[PDB]
Design a protein around this ligand. Sequence first.
Ligand SMILES: NC(=O)[C@H](Cc1ccc(C(F)(F)P(=O)(O)O)cc1)NC(=O)[C@H](Cc1ccccc1)NC(=O)Cc1ccc(C(F)(F)P(=O)(O)O)cc1
Ligand SMILES: CCCCCCCCO[C@@H]1O[C@H](CO)[C@@H](O)[C@H](O)[C@H]1O
Length: 286
Amino acid sequence: MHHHHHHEMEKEFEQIDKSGSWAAIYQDIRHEASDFPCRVAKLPKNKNRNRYRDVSPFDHSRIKLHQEDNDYINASLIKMEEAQRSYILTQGPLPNTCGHFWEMVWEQKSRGVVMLNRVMEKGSLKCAQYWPQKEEKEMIFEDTNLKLTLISEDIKSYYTVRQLELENLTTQETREILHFHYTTWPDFGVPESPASFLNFLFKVRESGSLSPEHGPVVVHCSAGIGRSGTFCLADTCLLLMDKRKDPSSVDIKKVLLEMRKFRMGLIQTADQLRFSYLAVIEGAKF
Ligand SMILES: NC(=O)[C@H](Cc1ccc(C(F)(F)P(=O)(O)O)cc1)NC(=O)[C@H](Cc1ccccc1)NC(=O)Cc1ccc(C(F)(F)P(=O)(O)O)cc1
Ligand SMILES: CCCCCCCCO[C@@H]1O[C@H](CO)[C@@H](O)[C@H](O)[C@H]1O
């Protein structure tokens, strides 16, 4: 990546931005997004496992819990072949799906969990607090046989990082889970700034939670599509820029449409699409 690559990327962003063209681009993405069946998500027995009736994982890419009773969880596997990275996008856990959430984390061998929403948004519970606090550092999950302990918690201006210890009560095997909570990303909004977003992303990256040596990172917001989608699109585009011989050949719309083959509605506003682009060209500098 030489200076001309940067120049063209920054110029392109500037042309789109000054002409206010993000709305048209975002509309084409929404209009062209693929649709697949979500039959399992729609079964009556799974009604209490979905936070929103309009947000469901497609059957072909949903994550299946390894349990036999009911393997359904509103979570999707996003597999980006070229970028060589897999992400699990899921909704903010409901009070009755916190066990399933950690069951999934355990089964997929994830090392990190990325949270981009807040527990209460617009006055209601958008995500159950599925992790422990200082007063009660240990949680035991109902019918999933897992125990979770808060090892450390570092609260910063725009995000918080926690080291958690996840144990399978049956086997006594324990694993370290790193929790990355971006705490200032409003629903249907954008991060505090490209810089704080990038510092966050790089912290996740530096931890090793996104490496193929570990299972897919679990990413979630409230519905698991707008913010989670923006987060993943930026990471994937930067990966493609670092891999391709010509980093300026990355087609943001095509990449997002590809990601949308795995989960509906990734990136919920034209401003989030704009932010992803901005995050990518600013991050390309590093
Ligand atoms: N669209 C939205 O904003 C969110 C999803 C979302 C929330 C947050 C985000 C996000 F971008 F912020 P994130 O970054 O967290 O992905 C994306 C999507 N969806 C909703 O608000 C919808 C009603 C609705 C349906 C269609 C259109 C508008 C409203 N509400 C529900 O689905 C909740 C809901 C209400 C009622 C019922 C029911 F009548 F069937 P029941 O008989 O079981 O009482 C089931 C589910
Ligand atoms: C998500 C990151 C996407 C980066 C896309 C970079 C696309 C660069 O594309 C180039 O931009 C130049 C400046 O306008 C144009 O003059 C060139 O014709 C165009 O090919």
